[PDB]
Amino acid sequence: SLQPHACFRLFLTMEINPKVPVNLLRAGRIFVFEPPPGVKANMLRTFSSIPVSRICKSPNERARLYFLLAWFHAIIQERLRYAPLGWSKKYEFGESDLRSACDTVDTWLDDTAKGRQNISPDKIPWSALKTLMAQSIYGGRVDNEFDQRLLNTFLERLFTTRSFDSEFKLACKVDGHKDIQMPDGIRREEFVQWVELLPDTQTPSWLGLPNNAERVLLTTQGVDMISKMLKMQMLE
């Protein structure tokens, strides 16, 4: 019933619930937020969340650690879909944990690199980042000891990189004669264009799972799509 100023938008954020009235759903443009599908799209959203000024600061090895943190966040959020093999519980691995991990990375890199442009890879605080993320940041939501063991295994595999050596395997995409190797770019733009150079096909084997872990589930949602057909063509 009201005419507003033109450059104004009323934002109404809410959870997807039946108690939201259909009149207000009719009244507004709806945008739905979900955990993004795929490692590539999740890492694109993560790199879009971090501003360019934060990552391009001194030292020059900040971008490699930010790429590793984005890859770790992407694989532990994409493992949430394949419950109960990716994680034994449906944890809420949101963005606050990623922001706290970024803050600890920035603070410990300012503490270690005393204004230097670059560090030899032996002197990077590996153990501080590993323990502070495995016990407080990402280990805070962990209940089972086996989930903590899996998190520690992922952090010990990911954060070594043979001390930033090239030809480092991130994972094994195909069991037959294929793997995902570490990009050798030394800047943020190289990492973004390497994210966009990822093949859009994926297996659960990107995350270390067996390839069949999604398989039956995929069949289920295929039939689910067919079930949704019974809502349209029956009404057609």
């Binding site: 109960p84 093999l85 990716g86 034994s88 519980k89 089972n144 086996f146 063991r149 899996l150 295994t153 992922f154 595999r157 270390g208 799972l209 067996p210």
Partner: protein, 44 residues
């Protein structure tokens, strides 16, 4: 080496029972066994 595997009550894996230590083969890796979610289910 030797790998520790939990035993869950069923496929929902929400009820841990006890741990089993298993000897690994001559070519496998314990990181793959920790990564793939290798567990034991009693009711299946």
């Amino acid at each position: 080496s030797v790998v520790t595997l939990p035993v869950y009550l069923n496929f929902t894996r929400a009820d841990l029972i006890f741990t089993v230590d298993f000897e690994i083969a001559t070519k496998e890796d314990p990181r793959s066994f920790y990564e793939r979610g290798v567990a034991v289910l009693c009711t299946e």
